[model samples]
Target: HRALDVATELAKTFRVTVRERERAGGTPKAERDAIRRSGLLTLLISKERGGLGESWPTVYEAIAEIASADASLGHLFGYHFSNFAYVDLFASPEQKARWYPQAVRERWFLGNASWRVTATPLPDGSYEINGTKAFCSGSADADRLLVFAVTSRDPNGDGRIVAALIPSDRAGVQVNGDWDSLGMRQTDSGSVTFSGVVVYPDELLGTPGQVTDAFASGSKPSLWTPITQLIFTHLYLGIARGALEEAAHYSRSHSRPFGVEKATEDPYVLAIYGEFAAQLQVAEAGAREVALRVQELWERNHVTPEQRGQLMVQVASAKIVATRLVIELTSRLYEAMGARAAASRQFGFDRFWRDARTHTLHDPVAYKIREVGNWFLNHRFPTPSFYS
Candidate 1:
């Protein structure tokens, strides 16, 4: 309830400055500070550790609420909570003791540099890591980094995959401020490089084959992957919701006479709004439905691959719907709102669609569609991978 209250209040703060911030290329330090002050950084951490111990459903709702105001911030917040969720799910109790309390106390902003990288294990149980990770979100202001890499020799093999937790400002780590994109531009999702940065053994959160381990086992280890996709579903849905609300507000006040009377009074405009409103409702419901399913499964200690795969397919189905709905609704709002609404920096109506367009590419919906269809016809589940 406390975290929910904070999110509800912060939505307005995020909404007003969203356009300016997106134009600025990344979230400003001041804006990040305001978020930090809100205690949302620890929204998923346990209250026993001096933080909010919210469930997946509530945490995701908070994300959607914030995303409805500002998608990029919502993305950052979602990724931040996902990072912590990963720790909670996979980290050893000792590692949790070491990292969780510190993260809660310091309100650390976590970022992922988990693309392909080369990590050479030293004789003394340290690793010399080197390579670049693209799409490193929140890199500009992150306190810690969750880095994934593999041995230089067999980068493609499952046994070689490894992950490490390290300070963002470690001596050899460099965050390249080279992110420039069509939308979600304020995400600061650029390239981060590691030039032989040293990571002690304790810094490695899980085993070498951590990624494949989940898939190989029948236990509910693949829980986080589907949850990750569900997070995006809400994010895009929230963007559509925001666009609709903004369009409605604009229509009521600013839309001029079009063939008949005011745009609000115009039958065509009203019908379009009504259609989009219904679609938005469906999108929200689908997102929450998948979220609740994932949440229920997340609480369970053991689940078979078939069970997990079915849930994964459900999430993929929702993702496909959400991806299409957000893109369509955000872009279509301009059609209903008339030309004047399209021309203003004040309105910044384009950001909603831009954010949707940029983020929907995080993974291809075509692949998701195939996955869902394959599951339906052949009972085949996608092999566990980052985007699956």
Candidate 2:
């Protein structure tokens, strides 16, 4: 609780200056480096492992707050949360014993370059891990890398695909740090390639042709997707709210001729603002409700397989809904801000749009729709351990 409180306080600090920087356009490595050095990365792990051990709700709240302040930080936090959850839940007792303590102590950071591999498997039970993983968040600074490879099989292909943990500094690993996207520049979302990397028997996760080594598809949540997605929902929604607040301030103070009336006095403005404001409120409510329920489920050990599936459905739904609402609200707010908001200075409305656009792309919307459709039509839910 105390740790979560600290994280929330940190996020509050971010709000004061995060949007100001966004208005300036582009993220500097120095800002991200500062955030990292502040030890915020360490909070992504659990307190049981020397982290905050924050419940899912608390974690989501913090991520949402930070993401709202800065999309770059949101992406960074999501990567850390996802990989930390991976080690926390999947590492073998020995692996955990060897690594978790120190990881917790140092607040070790992980970035997943996990991608589908296009390689042939070896007959000796060792498969060569090749191919590149792209859009890897925080790759430039991560201490560990989580990667995935497949043996010419589908991600859900009889368990032929597997997720692995590797030292980021290990041999056969190369970082391609040429991320030049329009938004979230500080994310350092680069690509990594593994060449002839041999994964041993002990290194493999999950049984072949069986189940996935992931959470949300199985009898119970795997503690990765559901938690991570939930946290992200809050982040995007908060960004929308932040944008709205700034736009609102501009609209109120600046007067415009609205057919013989001030723009602020225009009925149209009131109606539209009310609509977007309602959406922001509803999005936040949805996030809060889901977050609380998931936390309750975790604490009671009632996170059943069916419950896990439902949790994921809700998480995906929330992301789609919240991000869409954010996009809509930000667009509407910017139009209200008008040309003043377009200025390179005070009213830089474009940043809101950029943050929403780039951050939403983190998880492809198409995948979420497909996953839900598959669940609805086939009734073939993923087992708790499916890694994808």
Top candidate by lDDT: 1
- Candidate 2 residue-wise lDDT at 356: 79
Residue 227 displacement in candidate 2 (angstroms): 2.8
Alpha-carbon RMSD, each predicted model: 2.0, 4.4
10 residues in a row with least lDDT, candidate 1: 151-160
Which regions of candidate 2 fall more than 4 Å away from where they truly are? 1-5, 12-29, 36-39, 44-48, 115-128, 151-159, 198-217, 221-223, 253-263, 297-303, 343-346, 362-388
Clash pairs (backbone) in predicted model 1: none
Clash counts for all predictions? 0, 20
Q: Compared to the true structure, candidate 1 yields what TM-score?
A: 0.95
lDDT, candidate 1, at 252 = 87
Estimated TM-score per prediction? 0.95, 0.80
**What digit string (tens of lDDT, one per residue) describes model 1 on residues 26-95?**
5567767778888888766678877777788888898888999988888888888777666666788888
Highest TM-score among the candidates is held by which one?
1
* Candidate 2 lDDT by residue in tens digits, 1-388: 6655656666677666765664454334555555555566665444565554556666676676676666777767766777766555556667666566676565566777763555345666655677888767777767677777766643334326566666677777788877777666567776877777777655554444222533433533365667677766777887787777777788888746455477887777777789888977887888888888777665553356677777777777788788788878877775675566665564456777777777777668777777767777897553344222
Query: Candidate 2, which ten residues in sequence have the lowest lDDT sum?
Result: 208-217
